[PDB]
Amino acid sequence: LAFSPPFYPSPWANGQGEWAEAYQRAVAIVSQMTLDEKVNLTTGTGWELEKCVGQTGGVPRLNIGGMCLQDSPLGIRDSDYNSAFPAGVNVAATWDKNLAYLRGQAMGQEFSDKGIDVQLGPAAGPLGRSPDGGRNWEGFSPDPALTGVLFAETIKGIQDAGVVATAKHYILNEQEHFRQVAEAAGYGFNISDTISSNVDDKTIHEMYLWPFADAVRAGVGAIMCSYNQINNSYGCQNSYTLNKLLKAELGFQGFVMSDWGAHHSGVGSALAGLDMSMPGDITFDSATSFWGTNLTIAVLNGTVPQWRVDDMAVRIMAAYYKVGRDRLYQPPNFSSWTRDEYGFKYFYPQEGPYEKVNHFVNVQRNHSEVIRKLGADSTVLLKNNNALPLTGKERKVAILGEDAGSNSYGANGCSDRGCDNGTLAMAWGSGTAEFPYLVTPEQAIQAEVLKHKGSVYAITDNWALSQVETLAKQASVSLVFVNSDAGEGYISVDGNEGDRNNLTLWKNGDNLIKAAANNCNNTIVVIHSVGPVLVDEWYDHPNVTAILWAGLPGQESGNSLADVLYGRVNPGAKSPFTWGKTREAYGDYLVRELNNGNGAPQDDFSEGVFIDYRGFDKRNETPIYEFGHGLSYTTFNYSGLHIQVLNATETGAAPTFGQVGNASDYVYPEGLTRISKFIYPWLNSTDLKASSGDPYYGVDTAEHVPEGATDGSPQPVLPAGGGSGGNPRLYDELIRVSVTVKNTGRVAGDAVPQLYVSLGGPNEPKVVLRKFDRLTLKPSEETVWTTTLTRRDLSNWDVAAQDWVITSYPKKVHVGSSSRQLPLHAALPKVQ
Amino acid sequence: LAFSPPFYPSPWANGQGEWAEAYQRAVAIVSQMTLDEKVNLTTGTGWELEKCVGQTGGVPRLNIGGMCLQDSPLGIRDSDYNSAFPAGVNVAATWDKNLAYLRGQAMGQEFSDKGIDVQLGPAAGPLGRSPDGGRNWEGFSPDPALTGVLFAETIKGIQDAGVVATAKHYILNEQEHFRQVAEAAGYGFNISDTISSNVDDKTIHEMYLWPFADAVRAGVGAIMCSYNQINNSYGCQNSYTLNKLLKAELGFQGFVMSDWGAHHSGVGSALAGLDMSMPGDITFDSATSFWGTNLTIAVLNGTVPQWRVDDMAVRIMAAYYKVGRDRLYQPPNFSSWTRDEYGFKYFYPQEGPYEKVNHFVNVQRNHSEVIRKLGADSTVLLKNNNALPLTGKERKVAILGEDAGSNSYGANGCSDRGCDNGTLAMAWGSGTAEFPYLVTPEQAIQAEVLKHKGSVYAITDNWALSQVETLAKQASVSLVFVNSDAGEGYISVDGNEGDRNNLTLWKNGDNLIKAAANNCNNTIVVIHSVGPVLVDEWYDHPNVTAILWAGLPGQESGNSLADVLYGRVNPGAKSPFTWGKTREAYGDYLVRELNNGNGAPQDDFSEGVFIDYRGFDKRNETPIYEFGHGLSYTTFNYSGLHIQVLNVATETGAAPTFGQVGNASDYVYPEGLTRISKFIYPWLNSTDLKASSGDPYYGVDTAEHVPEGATDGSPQPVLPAGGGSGGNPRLYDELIRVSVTVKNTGRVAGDAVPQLYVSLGGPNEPKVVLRKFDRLTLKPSEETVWTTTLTRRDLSNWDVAAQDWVITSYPKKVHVGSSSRQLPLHAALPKVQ
């Protein structure tokens, strides 16, 4: 079985780079705290005990309010009068750093105005190993450069708005099946521990870890560790991924929190680099915690050093001060668990004072404008045989497909969006928000048609093919809507347990398109989906005259689409994944059956870096629509490639901050009423064993604490660490590349130039993306696009050196409009 | 068994009143015709043989194109790029003569621009005897005065736009059950003939005939006779209703056409007053006709007098010239039977040249604006506890009910509207049109809320009550949409065979309303329906803060409603029928079982004139919402009622003939002519009349089957009640002027609908009967004097001994006010005669 080697001790924060100020303030405040106050910072108060999906108790003596952590990466979850933004995969399709940032900002503002201190997003894990993974749509793209940049911009947007962002899920949570034992049991499978992602050291560095290096470097304040194991050690106590890769090598200064039920031990996780337990209890409402009381006892009894808990408290406070949260603090002014105005203060046990729990604060501002724009700028025009834009003069318009229409249960009518009914604007699970409303394609396109005095209808039953065919025969243009949905693994829709069972259009989508195209010579297909779908059966039908993929557009869906179809917005989006002819063309099969008896299923990432386009390229398979493909209402020319060559070894000892007293200091205080199921930091009595209630208390302790796990002395700095997101020399700029881009067509719009490198060597992909931008040019206008390649951009990870090295194989650079349209290339000069 | 006495001969046209000129042109052109040409005008060419749902062959030698007849009373049926107008019941609810006129003009324009000569509408039969009748919605109101006035304005709108209107269905077709023998068989009922409406002479004069008098007097060119029998004589050969009441008493100068399959004999129908056979064959595509060949033969063999067929020709051409159709003539430029651009000329057999059958002409103009306004102006505000209008500042708006949402098969996705899916904007059957689009309440309300930056959702599955209750608990206002549908009898939706099986909301509507009102203190109910529904279980819920009935609004439905809800239009509409506590409170049960063995079911109108509010008032039963009731966003005051007393041939000419009839050999099929399969022609196979007729009863007991007087072309007496248009002209003398002051006493501009009722007195007269109304726009504080006049007809009763209208000696009173139960002003009327 794959094995996860140890790396200890858990590195302590040190004020690195842009953290210096936040760190000194954290140390100043944590130095005033008692042990039970520190522990209150690290442990949630119990599932549904307070307002937010995650909430800690804070430190009231020092005026630090409990920290409220809320989903999702696309808008506030379980709340009211908030916006519902396009999913992260739509951000990836924009290839637009500025939009990623603005969406970040607009979300952080909404969260902040609800009294939420930490947003649980953005996501870059799953990166998107498999096309049918149930949660890729929450993240960005299976390409690490594209994902890393937009993930970092999203983070900066959210944090500049005063809310701590949480880069999740760390790491290798690439499929929903078998991610949690109790879930798998509900789906008929008996496993003793969750699926283990087994991954070699080079692949993890070059693919899955790279966007987390970007997030660290961009200043992200929190990381959420994952439910799956990595080489059979759970994500939230994997000393190699958390202590070595995240903290020692990437130099992460913020705090790591568990996913909800991902916490699996007290001492083991604390020493393997976890900082925050969510939602705080061992299972929901168990009234027990691996930390809380137990972490106070673990320090008192000598097993967890004081420097470890002190460092947890310092990382947590520093992330809070780093985004300025203290200046914006207010208690959460809504409840995740009810929409009632009044309720008991502590929801799950219905205890505490009966008082106002919801204030109905409308935090939307004018964010519907950035949503509508981001939806239009993420609508990829995959095919256009001279059909779009429409003029508004088409005499009779057929709107065809359930995906154009309303959810008959209401837009929020399926809990956590766990159904596929009506237009698909948001996929399912915890990665969701309540729509304030949902503009459907039927609404926006019919309103556009009626504004020009046209005739228009919508057919939204995909088995009503008799009606579809009759109307398609009468129409000037048929706009056909289809979808494919997926989501987090605790919800199953039509037998898809989070992950998609296939890549085919749902609700009869292929038969619908053929019914319409067989009968109307101007049939235009619009796809809303979580990821790629198979288009092979109809994409080259001679009456399918255009095809668009609009992703998961959020609340302004129909308006974002009508803007594109009627030429108000010239589509500039590019596919952020590959569109293959078959499911087999992508390889990388999900693990769907137990392969390790009733032990943890074993998920070997045996393709290495070869996922999405790298895998297609290596197999010489031609995609229908490649990574980076998308059309425009204008054309662009790329010419004139120009290349120019450009000109701590030990840590401190672990500090302690403040003092730890006798057990009687930490016994429940006398006048306090303990709320049922509420998780506290306090002990029932000075008897440590009885107060822990742990059946393993004090047994074989030293044998269960890895070697080095308590060592507070100065540590070596890793060759690849020493900076933020890696050794700073990885970020030196070695080569400048420039090209001329001209708009040669007749419509103003945006080009997305893309720069790929060939690193060389028998095991390297043919091309890997490194740089891109999105540049606005009016007709005939030109501009020089210039960018630089960093030492990291030209390196591979070398397992013998434990460092990035520029290998001696000759390297090339390529510039053009997609991974398969690269008219400009050059050999790169040797650099090191 | 009820018996229908004979009245013969069938009166001939005479150029009465405004028909003088059209009649002179008709005689001049018909005087040039041969017998086979005249026959061609009276007979359709067979089901689906040409373009229009009925079409004659015309008279090509004299450049008279075939007449194209097309449904429906609310917009062009079976066509493209046309508008879908609100139903006739909505026009009733507007109480607005001007809107009725403007809707008739917008429709006539559209029909004319498609090459259609005759619109098959508007409808005042069924009048609305039973609240669950399947086609009341196509007509206006169970009240004869309200109906007759808006029917007449609708006809003047259509005809002033250059298309012949057809007043239908004449007469007493007050239910769909047992209306046609083959339809009844399709439903498991074995009957030998159609249901017989059996009605006394005074009720038919005072109720069902009255709007047809107004139609005739307003100039209607055509009348369509009905499928039912009346006293066991078929509506399209009933000499009493056709010859006596319509032609001799009301003085009708235009032509009578059959309903489709309502023609039941050649000789008998022609003598009893029918003028045109539709669609022309005996049964669809039977290639046989009671007329066509048979009518040419019936004149040749002496059974039907030449003057009778000359008169059919003269009435048909006169209706055509009267509206000026000859000046707008063009072949129908669409096909009812296919939307294809090209097709065989003759659809049913797929024969004739292969040529252009559709030109896709867009005839809609800006008719959406009159549709939008008439939908808003027909939305009756039944209850409003200071809930409406909305301001747009409502923070969260719940739109609840399938009736708010789209039809998942597309607006036209159910053939002839035969389903109740999504919002109900048009009921079912032949009285239908293709929507060019349909704006749903969901669309227009959600767009309104978004313009204000509110939050809004629509739940459109009426059994998703968990989601309904959860959203309603969150909502500032819950707008709940419910409906009840019905239509022509040839379609059955959910076991409703045209007629509605009950008056209860469809699709779980009562439960949906309770789910919302139990959870939301500001629940507003919007009803789309063909007629009244039972509101008793929830209308007085303390959380139901407003209730509206918006009828069947046609293609602008959601915009018409949003205009009212957000106060761009202050509702002025008034209920045109009564909302009772129970079905039993209306009486007037439909006949739903065979009650005459396997012969015609017998439908006795034993309540007489006591239908709708007359019945409630006679029984002292209190409606929840009375006839005439509607609220407004302002209030009106009525004061100062005052009354002021104000200051014909006896024989016809002899029946004329125009032009000549020759030998049988003149009428044999022309040798150079390809005879299209199923097409109906006027020609004879040979000079052998018996053989050419193919009639198994040819020459059988003929004299016995020709009623006494049926061939009598001599001068006839003029009936005491006849001699004018819509009756003896002395019936229209104005005898009393009434005036009252109407004031807007509230804070916003709005329309009042003052209503003038009379009590005619007598032990068996209704307590009150509507006679006058108008719809008057007033700004806040503004006052106006409303003046109208009562005619001699308005004060009379039908006296069956006299066969005339008489003002009886019981003292009469006038009552003016805002509804049939809210009449604060009353005056005794002085004796007048």
Ligand SMILES: *[C@@H]1O[C@H](CO)[C@@H](O[C@@H]2O[C@H](CO)[C@@H](O[C@@H]3O[C@H](CO[C@H]4O[C@H](CO[C@H]5O[C@H](CO)[C@@H](O)[C@H](O)[C@@H]5O[C@H]5O[C@H](CO)[C@@H](O)[C@H](O)[C@@H]5O)[C@@H](O)[C@H](O[C@H]5O[C@H](CO)[C@@H](O)[C@H](O)[C@@H]5O[C@H]5O[C@H](CO)[C@@H](O)[C@H](O)[C@@H]5O)[C@@H]4O)[C@@H](O)[C@H](O[C@H]4O[C@H](CO)[C@@H](O)[C@H](O)[C@@H]4O[C@H]4O[C@H](CO)[C@@H](O)[C@H](O)[C@@H]4O)[C@@H]3O)[C@H](O)[C@H]2NC(C)=O)[C@H](O)[C@H]1NC(C)=O
């Ligand atoms: C001061 O106060 C403190 C607070 O109260 C006291 O704290 C308690 O101390 C106890 C010890 O005194 C702790 O109990 C022991 O816990 C260990 C750790 O269990 C967790 O981690 C397991 C993985 O361990 C590796 O990885 C972590 C880091 O991730 C390391 O910390 C470990 O040292 C170990 O490292 C090796 O491996 C990694 C790579 O993976 C390398 O990198 C390293 O170099 C090392 O090689 C993990 O598997 C555990 O998962 C179980 O528990 C989860 C629920 O918690 C459950 O979800 C999982 O499915 C799994 O369930 C199964 O096992 C549990 C029992 O652990 C059963 O109850 C359950 O039925 C299932 O069987 C977990 O997340 C734990 O291993 C110990 O248990 C082993 O040993 C005891 C005997 O001593 C046996 O009785 C047990 O069966 C078990 O035996 C297995 O393991 C042995 C290998 O070690 C092997 O020999 C056996 O054959 C068998 O395979 C103890 O349970 C307790 O956690 C802690 N409490 C709190 C609140 O923190 C403290 O004691 C006190 N101090 C003093 C001085 O008084």
Ligand SMILES: *[C@@H]1O[C@H](CO)[C@@H](O[C@@H]2O[C@H](CO)[C@@H](O[C@@H]3O[C@H](CO[C@H]4O[C@H](CO)[C@@H](O)[C@H](O)[C@@H]4O)[C@@H](O)[C@H](O[C@H]4O[C@H](CO)[C@@H](O)[C@H](O)[C@@H]4O[C@H]4O[C@H](CO)[C@@H](O)[C@H](O)[C@@H]4O[C@H]4O[C@H](CO)[C@@H](O)[C@H](O)[C@@H]4O)[C@@H]3O)[C@H](O)[C@H]2NC(C)=O)[C@H](O)[C@H]1NC(C)=O
């Ligand atoms: C870890 O995080 C957790 C979660 O956030 C922290 O747990 C919370 O800690 C709070 C203390 O910081 C504790 O707050 C208490 O709440 C009680 C309930 O308050 C609500 O109800 C009351 C009463 O109806 C309303 O007034 C109030 O506004 C709330 O709606 C309060 O009643 C407690 O008030 C008392 O203490 C505060 C100061 O803490 C005083 O200012 C206040 O006057 C009260 O003082 C009396 O009681 C205290 C001790 O209870 C005595 O010391 C004092 O002398 C007074 O005693 C008189 O009155 C009491 C009865 O009231 C009488 O018995 C006595 O004989 C005297 O006559 C306080 O406000 C939260 O409840 C608690 N949350 C939960 C879920 O448990 C935890 O602290 C964090 N841990 C660390 C280490 O940081």
Ligand SMILES: *[C@@H]1O[C@H](CO)[C@@H](O[C@@H]2O[C@H](CO)[C@@H](O[C@@H]3O[C@H](CO[C@H]4O[C@H](CO)[C@@H](O)[C@H](O)[C@@H]4O)[C@@H](O)[C@H](O[C@H]4O[C@H](CO)[C@@H](O)[C@H](O)[C@@H]4O[C@H]4O[C@H](CO)[C@@H](O)[C@H](O)[C@@H]4O[C@H]4O[C@H](CO)[C@@H](O)[C@H](O)[C@@H]4O)[C@@H]3O)[C@H](O)[C@H]2NC(C)=O)[C@H](O)[C@H]1NC(C)=O
């Ligand atoms: C009752 O109503 C019914 C239904 O409306 C009436 O029935 C219709 O009557 C029409 C009038 O007679 C009759 O029309 C005939 O249609 C034929 C076919 O028309 C179409 O297809 C052809 C063939 O592909 C196309 O070419 C044509 O354009 C149409 O698309 C025609 O072939 C007949 O046309 C001729 O006669 C008329 C006079 O009516 C001329 O004006 C016209 O120009 C044609 O003229 C030639 O034919 C006549 C012989 O009648 C000659 O006298 C003349 O000099 C021309 O001669 C040359 O050409 C002919 C024919 O090719 C040739 O044989 C000769 O030697 C010369 O070379 C005519 O148009 C409809 O078919 C019929 N509809 C149905 C469904 O049956 C009915 O009449 C009404 N009854 C009454 C009593 O009013």
Ligand SMILES: *[C@@H]1O[C@H](CO)[C@@H](O[C@@H]2O[C@H](CO)[C@@H](O[C@@H]3O[C@H](CO[C@H]4O[C@H](CO[C@H]5O[C@H](CO)[C@@H](O)[C@H](O)[C@@H]5O[C@H]5O[C@H](CO)[C@@H](O)[C@H](O)[C@@H]5O)[C@@H](O)[C@H](O)[C@@H]4O)[C@@H](O)[C@H](O[C@H]4O[C@H](CO)[C@@H](O)[C@H](O)[C@@H]4O)[C@@H]3O)[C@H](O)[C@H]2NC(C)=O)[C@H](O)[C@H]1NC(C)=O
């Ligand atoms: C990949 O992954 C996807 C996602 O998980 C998989 O998709 C599922 O595929 C299943 C297997 O194919 C799908 O299940 C099938 O669904 C069919 C349709 O179900 C729905 O629609 C029907 C038909 O509705 C019409 O008729 C109704 C009245 O009967 C009417 O109300 C409705 O409005 C429609 O009206 C039109 O049609 C009638 C005439 O038919 C006209 O009169 C009318 O005017 C209109 O024109 C409805 O009956 C049904 O209840 C439902 O709403 C079912 O039809 C399938 O049934 C066939 O097989 C049955 C058992 O399997 C058997 O009973 C029966 O005999 C049938 O032959 C079947 O349930 C499922 O929906 C898909 N799910 C999604 C989310 O898309 C996919 O399989 C995977 N692909 C691969 C390759 O693995």
Ligand SMILES: *[C@@H]1O[C@H](CO)[C@@H](O)[C@H](O)[C@H]1NC(C)=O
């Ligand atoms: C008239 O002649 C046609 C053509 O032969 C024949 O088919 C039809 O049946 C005949 N009609 C009658 C009544 O005999």
